[PDB]
C-alpha cells in the first residue's frame, strides 16, 4: 500500500527486496508530510535562494541563432552552486533525511555532480556522507572526486561491471539494503523505486517553473519547445513538469547516442532498449536478448546509464514528450560552439541538449521557433576530456 | 507436485531441520557445477537453492557476485541453466528444487513462459529477490498456473499485515532473513527471532528456512533450536568453489565434508 501512485502508466513500481519496503514507505510518508508543511517549504526555498543561488538566469543566445528564425534561451543551471542542477533536489532530500531523523547519507554519481551535491549538502546540514563512483568515472570526471573529498565525503571507486554510473547505482543500493536504519539513500536521478522518481521531480520542478515565468516576462508567450538531456531523467523532468499541462509546449528529451545507435555503444534505452525490471523499477533498458542488463556508453559520464526514469517512458508512450538522440561528435560540436560564440562552457551532458536545438535550427532555418535548452551544468569537469579528444583529433 | 510438502513431513518425523546449500548454476563451468550439485546431494543436502547467473545481482554480496561472473566467463546462459536443471531433476526425482531469480530474468521474454519453463524441467519453487509481495501479483499467478511455488520473504523488519500476506501468497516454504544487507558469509545474522516463527506458524505459513550469513554448523543447529524448519547457506559453499578452482577434485571433497558437517548439525 502507498499514499501516491508508484506507476506512470505501466512504468515504475517498487521492485526492491522486501527488506527495503519499510524504508520506501517511510520516505514516501515523510515526503507527503513535508510537501504540505509550510515550514519545510520555507526552509527549502531559503536554501535554494540564499545558499544555491536560485533563481538561475535565462540567457538569450546573441550569436548562435543569427540568420535563422530560431530564438534560443538557455536555462542557466550551470550557475547553481556546485555547477549543476543536481544541487536542487539534494537540498530537499537532505532536509527530508533530517526530518526523518537519519544521520548518514548514501549517494551514487557518474559525472560527480550528484556526488559533489550530496557532499556539499551533507557538510552544510551536518550529515555523514559516502559516495559511490565507477572507477572509469573516477578518471574522466576527476575534478569532482577531489571536490567531494575536500567536503568531508568518503568516495568509493566501483570496479564492478562497466565501472560507470550503473555500477555505482548498484553498490549504493546494495549498501542501503544493509544500512537504511541510519542512512538515507539520496538517489540522484528521477529513477529507481517509488517514491524517488516522484520526489526528484518535485524537488527539481522549480527549473520549469522559473523558465515559464522568465519566458513569459521576456517574450510574452510560452516556448514552442523545451529541450533537455536525459540520463536517468532528473534535469529533464525538472524542466518539463510545469509545462506538462501546457499542451502547446513541446517537451524534447535527448539521450546519448554515443558512437551511434547502430554501434550499440550508446545510452539511449528509452528509444533503443526494451522494457525490463532493474534498479527497483520497470523501465526501458538496454538489455541482451536473454535479459542481462547491457552496459551503456557515452562520452559524457552523467548520461552513461542503460535505463531511464519511468515518467519519461510514460510521457513518451502517450506522445506528450518526444525523445531523440545525439552522438558524441554532435555533443562535442555543440560544446565548442557555445564556448566560442556565447562564452559559456557547458557540461558535456547539457551539450547533448544544445546539439539537438542547433539541429532543430540548422535543419529548418526559416522555421519560427522559440526554444529553451536546459543548460543542466557547467563543463569545467569536462575540459580535460574535450582537450584530449580535440588533440588526438588534430 | 508436492516435493516441499513431502520433504518437510519427512524431516518432521525424523526430528530434523533441512540443510539447503545455494550455488550458482554453471559456476565454475557446466560440467563441474553438475558435479558440485550431485556432491551436495550425496553429502546430505535436503533441498537446493540454485541461482541463475544475472548481470546485476543486487541482493548479492561479492562472493556470489563472483560466482555469477565465473558462470558468465564460462558462457553460461539461462538456457544452459535450464538444461542443467532438467538433468538434475532426471537424476534426483524427489529433492525440492528452488531457484533464486532476479526479476528481469523472469520478466525478460514473458513471465508466463518463464514459469512454464520451470515446470518443464521440474523446478518446485521460484524466489524472485527484487519483487516484494506488493509487486508480486503477475509472478505468483504465473507460478501457481504452472505448479510452481512462489517464495516470499519475511524480514526481521516484518509487520503483521506483511506476515498475513506472506502466509496467504507464498507456497512451499517461507524465507526467514537472518539480517538486512546482501548475501555474505562474513556478515553473521541474528538468532531467528522466535516472534516471527511463532506468528508465521500461527498464520499457517509454509515452513521457514533461515538464510543469509549461515556458514557454520553451530548456526544451523541454532536455527532449528529456534523453531525454523531449516537453514540455507550460500556464500560459505561458494567460497569453497572459489578457493579450489585449480583443484576440482579437492573442491568436491571439501564441499562434501562441509555439507555433511552442516547437515549433521540439523539433526535434533
Ligand atoms: O549464505 P549467504 O549469506 O550467501 O546467503 C545465501 C542466500 N541465497 S538465496 O538464494 O537463499 C537468496 C535469497 C534471497 C535473496 O534476496 C532476497 F532476500 F531479497 F530475496 C538473495 C539470495
Ligand atoms: C550522473 C551524474 N550527472 C548527470 C548529469 C545529467 C544527467 O542526469 P539527469 O538525466 O538525472 O539530469 C545532466 N546534466 C548534468 C550536468 C549532469 O551532471 C552525476 O552527477 O552523478
Ligand atoms: Na536515458
Automatic annotation (TrEMBL), chain B:
Record carries keyword Metal-binding: no
UniProt GO molecular function: tryptophan synthase activity
EC nos: 4.2.1.20
InterPro entries per UniProt: Aldolase_TIM, RibuloseP-bd_barrel, Trp_synthase_alpha_AS, Trp_synthase_suA
Reaction equation(s) it catalyzes: (1S,2R)-1-C-(indol-3-yl)glycerol 3-phosphate + L-serine = D-glyceraldehyde 3-phosphate + L-tryptophan + H2O
This protein's record includes keyword Ubl conjugation: no
Pfam families on file: Trp_syntA (PF00290)
Alphabetical keyword list: Amino-acid biosynthesis, Aromatic amino acid biosynthesis, Lyase, Tryptophan biosynthesis
Pathway: Amino-acid biosynthesis; L-tryptophan biosynthesis; L-tryptophan from chorismate: step 5/5
GO cellular component terms given for this protein: cytosol
Catalytic site positions: 49, 60
Domain of life: Bacteria
HAMAP family tied to this protein: Trp_synth_alpha
Free-text function comment from the UniProt entry: The alpha subunit is responsible for the aldol cleavage of indoleglycerol phosphate to indole and glyceraldehyde 3-phosphate.
Assembly behavior: Tetramer of two alpha and two beta chains.
Similarity-based family: Belongs to the TrpA family.
Protein name stated in the entry: Tryptophan synthase alpha chain
Naturally occurring in which organism (per UniProt): Salmonella typhimurium
Encoding gene per record: trpA
